[PDB]
Ligand binder design. Structure first.
Ligand SMILES: *[C@@H]1O[C@H](CO)[C@@H](O[C@@H]2O[C@H](CO)[C@@H](O[C@@H]3O[C@H](CO)[C@@H](O)[C@H](O[C@H]4O[C@H](CO)[C@@H](O)[C@H](O)[C@@H]4O)[C@@H]3O)[C@H](O)[C@H]2NC(C)=O)[C@H](O)[C@H]1NC(C)=O
Ligand SMILES: *[C@@H]1O[C@H](CO)[C@@H](O[C@@H]2O[C@H](CO)[C@@H](O[C@@H]3O[C@H](CO)[C@@H](O)[C@H](O[C@H]4O[C@H](CO)[C@@H](O)[C@H](O)[C@@H]4O)[C@@H]3O)[C@H](O)[C@H]2NC(C)=O)[C@H](O)[C@H]1NC(C)=O
Ligand SMILES: *[C@@H]1O[C@H](CO)[C@@H](O[C@@H]2O[C@H](CO)[C@@H](O)[C@H](O)[C@H]2NC(C)=O)[C@H](O)[C@H]1NC(C)=O
Ligand SMILES: *[C@@H]1O[C@H](CO)[C@@H](O[C@@H]2O[C@H](CO)[C@@H](O)[C@H](O)[C@H]2NC(C)=O)[C@H](O)[C@H]1NC(C)=O
Ligand SMILES: *[C@@H]1O[C@H](CO)[C@@H](O[C@@H]2O[C@H](CO)[C@@H](O)[C@H](O)[C@H]2NC(C)=O)[C@H](O)[C@H]1NC(C)=O
Ligand SMILES: [Mg+2]
Ligand SMILES: [Mg+2]
Ligand SMILES: [Mg+2]
Ligand SMILES: [Mg+2]
Ligand SMILES: [Mg+2]
Ligand SMILES: [Mg+2]
Lengths: 167, 139, 164, 167, 139, 164, 139, 139, 139, 139, 164, 167
């Protein structure tokens, strides 16, 4: 139990007072005949460590319009904030998750911590759209369908088959 | 007792009315000592020369590419604000951050007030009490 | 009178002076020994704007983009022409949105198809409270004209308030 | 007539003093037996509204080297400034009116408020020069002159005719 | 008769589908001589070595900061397009304009096709037949 | 079953329906009246990834740069593919070095072949003293857990010190 | 004999008149074979389809931020130039260099002409015959 | 009475002599209270520690791309200025605006002076009294 | 006697430990008057409200492109620094220079300290005493 | 049979010696028809006028801010390379991509050679046969 | 001695070893069975700088721009060469104006055809009052050398004044 | 000998005291019966002029990590700094001397005051390397060597000769 030094005011005797645990502050210091009175931190204030503050710290982390609470102000900790859905954190801002354009697809969706990740669609796959959810999808497979090839696909357009075989 | 104050950015700070910024006056680092406050304004109760100051933390994504940060006096004797200390900054020259700081000595009478205005106000980061603020002390 | 053009008769070889064709037309067939130049009307999507002796009209090859509308249609005598749509102004080959005057500044001229919004900082005794591409600087509410007393001084970005 | 409250110093009685009109300031407040003495604002100072200032405001709008007075400092108003001939206002500066290059012409001249406006010369017209006054001018018209076409014009050069017809 | 063609930007050029550009083939400067066209493709009828080219005028406002412009072959013998001549450009470094040109000699059999693709398509100015085009000739 | 392709027999002229060749192969010789399509294996540096009737395999034309290694080799059935080497991440066609989190910030995710280092400012009670692309925010030394008293408060960039 | 030409930048190339560039036609790499030249124009004597091209080396110091480089036809049958192949470039985004290349196949009758124009002309480096040029050949 | 002053930009402010800036001392917001002024300098008449400060509003069109804003002491005991508080800013990175602010405590004796210098001086906007200024108060 | 101090950048100023900056306290312009110093910190011996300030001269060659400059309180009552006044600047937008200035009034008790931290610290020019500094005075 | 060739970027293309690029001549899209190749050079065997071209894909990270791309002749009759078609580009105005294309008609005797050089070489992307190439054909 | 070149005699077909031609010349006619190589002088606007067997001299194709003058003329043995005119320096293929040292800084080296003005901040006891591309830092007026007293201390940008 | 005025404290008489020369400061002002005592400036301090300072100025010019002393702190002058070998001064920084790339060569080496100067290699010369010392060197001269030309050189590669003549 960590302590701090003090003095009894009636006698002048030296005292050894208990500090106060997370969530509390020193409302009244010890005396020769009583321990330190630890008060609970009021709303909007916290102490995260053992301390001998006479007032708790202010919960001063405010969430912007693109953020929401990752943790509430509690007597034990300050508030904390993360980017809301659709946004990631960068350089103290909350930016819009990028879209992967046509020709490329999502390999990891965006999170509050990272931007959308993207790759160029590999051979055999495509993405036709600018999108922050769409992955590279495999081309329509004319041979598996027993159908004739009509127009070959690319990294940004699906293969087209006719509607019948050749005979 | 020598008048002083330090007011901090708050959740209410940006009214979007084109009126002045609002400030916190009691919690965390903010205090008033021999000055008052009403609706964004520091209200003077003791006449004299004051060093007034304000810092605003500005920030934005890419991009009136010009930001004006100022302190202005209101007096009941005249129906328009008087400019005291004003800065113009074009910091938008992606994510950017810039701080604007103003300080200076002005004479203020009892019943006069001082307010801070930023145009455009929405570039002000009001989320951290250590970053945008407004204060004064008598000299 | 009617402008002209030299032409070697095919199969005579003499130098003829033929009439050119007028705007809206082109040369279906050249002038001969006995016959004048035969002129035909430009088909749709084509034009000639000047006298000419083209064997085919020029193509109306100006296309309007999504930000643009026809200032003139494709006619027999001229190409299509385009201007920026409502809300845009023509800058460096593009159609940009009209800008907005911030609080503290007022519109001194509306945006047009060729011109961005023009803005100035609100002069003394005037105000604008919003970012707008129409709103001009307006004079402060005059407390003494309304018979009231002053409540809160106004600014270049806020109206003067008077006490009831 | 707007007013302000005051106190007679001899008696302590409450007074209701007249404010002072544009162009003036309170040189002496009212007394029980006289109205407020309104002084005229001295040079370099103004009041634009009814007021009870004891000193007029300072005419603090100074014109830069590229500006000139749109209004003089008057007892009723502050000075005001506009860009001098050849310059337009932008972002609190006075910039040089742009020139429209060859191939393009002026459709509105520059003013203190706006920059030169320019268009690409339409068909049949030209501008050969970089200029902040020159408009697109119609090509020399060989047919109207009864002359042969020598070299066709463009948007940045005039049509050339010979000096005679063809016969 | 030596095959040649020159095809031009048209009102229909930008499909938005991620497929090939479409082109005009008969009006104004466009023509076909001993080649064909089918849904954006030049279709070869006489086998041989061709010089193929294309120019696209690019432009936009600010900022897929990278543009790819290419010419691709389609053959019935393989179910995916084959790259022939491709460029990547990052011209976004307000209003900008850049033009991309590609040319090169390739072998093409009867029945094979060539197409152009640009990603992103939307930066292509198709409004002027002199500025975006696609052609070829046998060498 | 096996996909196919139409083919005009050279010297018969009848429409044949021939078997295409499988991935890893190409057509050495087309199908005739009596003979099936003859398929041959792709030689080295060449591939076919799909059924096909190519007369020659496609060339394995993907080359790895100095910042890159093979994620897949050139095989009879696919082209080579490349990824960024250790210490780099794939951005806009290039391989960039993994970034470093400054003092005051910690790694919340290692860099990978596709992803830059992810960093956040050290939350309260935690610290990072160095620019590093591995080091995470660590909790402050806890003086009361060690039975010591506080010497110097820590920060987002320095550890708390306790007095002996 | 197949018409061809390659003409090069010369000391006289930039007239300043808003007209076409002029070119060298016989010295160093310049030549004419079955085509002619007249005051900046290549003059066609055998009718047909030609591949025409031109490259201009552009350069300057800082910043008409937009450059237009084009090839234009002149015919006695119409009293205005006709656009063939044009590019717009904004390369000013201190010292910079950019080169613009244009090529394309066009139909030209005997007696018609082709010219090159750049606006603004002054950004063209004409001091080196290998860097600005204009040519053609029949295809 | 505690010495203080606030001097404002004036029409005379930029001498172009390479000497210090000049300032207004009486009109509008400017005042002297227990300090004097002579030729650009604040003149100290009471010895002690002063917080001195100066703000200059800088602005320009495009672009020594480096601006130096400083406060300097003159004493009769030594024939050269002493640097007190100096900032270097390269804000030119079209129309731009930037504010430079300096403040700090220095010890000054009676008969010493303080001046402000900007290099390059012509970037200083001296047209608004709220924008460029120089002051001090004893602490 | 009213507490004041002005500390100046020194050769020791950048520890590279992620701890606070260190400062000179006696030579040249630096002084302490009724405040103390220990290991980078201003140590308070008289309780009251102080205006604290710090200026750091930043500079670099091209380019965390974001610089944080702050003043922080240490108290024996709590085992973590408290942020007082903080600025974030992204000035890297070749050679560049920028100054960051912070000032404000805070209440400090005897035995509390104030330190300055910059991240990243190495952009601080510590070579000139007039350029980076840290001080305070009671108000 | 009309001479033609198209040669492509290869793993060996960038020697680092300051000499010419090397190229692939048989795999994938590369071929030779009535021309030869020797250590980077196309070697002419039938005298005449050739249209020569080359495209290089350029790219890098930040910033010899100027790139020169050219085609040069070698003849046994003179002991130095002769410039044919050259471009200078400054595309470094983080990641960028630009492509440079050159084409033009030149006269070449039997036994003469053409090469390509880029300075600096290291900015050339040789990893893709569709993006850097060199070819010719007789016209 | 004289360098040489192999040559197949046209109509003999034997391998001859012919003399090349010297700088300033070119081959008018090749060496035969009995005759040496015939060399002719380069005509105006043309040159050869090395021994050679060119059939025509190279063209003097270097042109000076408006900011440039000839450092060498076109000669039979070399091409023209250009340098920046007075007041300019050669940077990245261009001719830029010499820079000016602001007040507070002095010229430590004049601009030349290859080099910009070099500037340094005026060291202590020295000054420069003007933006100039010639003016160096000069020492302050020395009041004690002139027998006068100090009036106003000087700076890096203003001279010390002494009282009469 | 420059002077300053003073007052004798015992009598009140006016005095004319000697100032103190470079390298010294006034440790004790004059009296009616003794001259001014000039003290020598202590380490880390200087006076460069005649003066009547009571403390010498501080040698406040500190050398950065890319700099070294051009002059030491002396009693007569402040310290001064220059860029170390390999660096030149620009805009108050010490930058790395540039390299001249292939195709170009050094015409002046870098100094503490200026950057490397470079030219494009003229005809007949080459530089194969990116270097901040290498100059344009003349091509290998096949004719002077009596050897056959094998491959012509350029501005960035040397001419190659075979190893024999032609006969
Ligand atoms: C040289 O001068 C001759 C005059 O001797 C001149 O020819 C004139 O050209 C103009 C421009 O093309 C012609 O104007 C047109 O007239 C026709 C009817 O004949 C109209 O139908 C045209 O269309 C208008 O229609 C639109 C509505 O759909 C309108 O909104 C729009 O404004 C259109 O212009 C058009 O007015 C005119 O006919 C001739 N005149 C003669 C006698 O031929 C020629 O242009 C001059 N050359 C040059 C190079 O400047
Ligand atoms: C290989 O070595 C041989 C030597 O055995 C060498 O040939 C030499 O070349 C130089 C460069 O062209 C020649 O120098 C010239 O000489 C002539 C007279 O014969 C002069 O007229 C030349 O002009 C000068 O004139 C200007 C005035 O108008 C001067 O200002 C200027 O400086 C000019 O240079 C010039 O000096 C020299 O003649 C030959 N020597 C022989 C014996 O042939 C060759 O250059 C070397 N090869 C390589 C690739 O380096
Ligand atoms: C506000 O309203 C009143 C009147 O309706 C204006 O008061 C007048 O001011 C002028 C200007 O000097 C005088 O000449 C009149 O005699 C005043 N009349 C009255 C009845 O008060 C006043 O000017 C208005 N203010 C503004 C800025 O427009
Ligand atoms: C530091 O160490 C101690 C224990 O080893 C922690 O003290 C405890 O704090 C919690 C939180 O309120 C209490 O519920 C316990 O009763 C405390 N126990 C003791 C023995 O002191 C403390 O929380 C640790 N601090 C941090 C930030 O982790
Ligand atoms: C200014 O002028 C005087 C002399 O003309 C210089 O004074 C001398 O200073 C040196 C340096 O310590 C002494 O050794 C001499 O004895 C002094 N002589 C006299 C007669 O005063 C002085 O140094 C000059 N100042 C400067 C900066 O150059
Ligand atoms: Mg996609
Ligand atoms: Mg508005
Ligand atoms: Mg014009
Ligand atoms: Mg870290
Ligand atoms: Mg100077
Ligand atoms: Mg080199």
């Amino acid at each position: 139990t960590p302590t701090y030094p003090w003095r009894d005011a009636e006698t002048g005797e030296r005292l050894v007072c208990a500090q106060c645990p997370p969530g509390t502050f020193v409302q009244r210091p010890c005396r020769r005949d009583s321990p330190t009175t630890c008060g609970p931190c009021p709303p909007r204030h916290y102490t995260q460590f053992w301390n001998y503050l006479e007032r708790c710290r202010y919960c001063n982390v405010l969430c912007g319009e693109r953020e929401e609470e990752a943790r509430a102000c509690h007597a034990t900790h300050n508030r904390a904030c993360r980017c809301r859905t659709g946004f990631f954190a960068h350089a103290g801002f909350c930016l819009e998750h990028a879209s992967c354009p046509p020709g490329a697809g999502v390999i990891a969706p965006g999170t509050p911590s990272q931007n959308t990740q993207c790759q160029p669609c590999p051979p055999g796959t495509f993405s036709a759209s600018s999108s922050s959810s769409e992955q590279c999808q495999p081309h329509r497979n004319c041979t598996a369908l027993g159908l004739a090839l009509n127009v070959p696909g690319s990294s940004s357009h699906d293969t087209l088959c006719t509607s019948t075989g050749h005979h | 007792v020598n008048p002083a104050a330090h007011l901090t950015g708050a959740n209410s700070s940006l009214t979007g009315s084109g009126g002045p910024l609002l400030w916190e006056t009691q919690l965390g680092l903010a205090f008033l000592r021999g000055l008052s406050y009403h609706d964004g304004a520091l209200v003077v109760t003791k006449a004299g020369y004051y060093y007034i100051y304000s810092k605003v933390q500005l920030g934005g994504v890419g991009c009136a590419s010009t930001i004006t940060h100022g302190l202005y006096k209101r007096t009941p004797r005249y129906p328009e604000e008087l400019e005291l200390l004003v800065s113009q900054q074009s910091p938008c020259g992606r994510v950017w951050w810039d701080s604007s700081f103003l300080g200076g000595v002005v004479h203020l009478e009892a019943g006069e007030e001082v307010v801070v205005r930023v145009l455009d106000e929405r570039l002000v980061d009001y989320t951290k009490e250590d970053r945008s603020y407004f204060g004064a002390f008598m000299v």
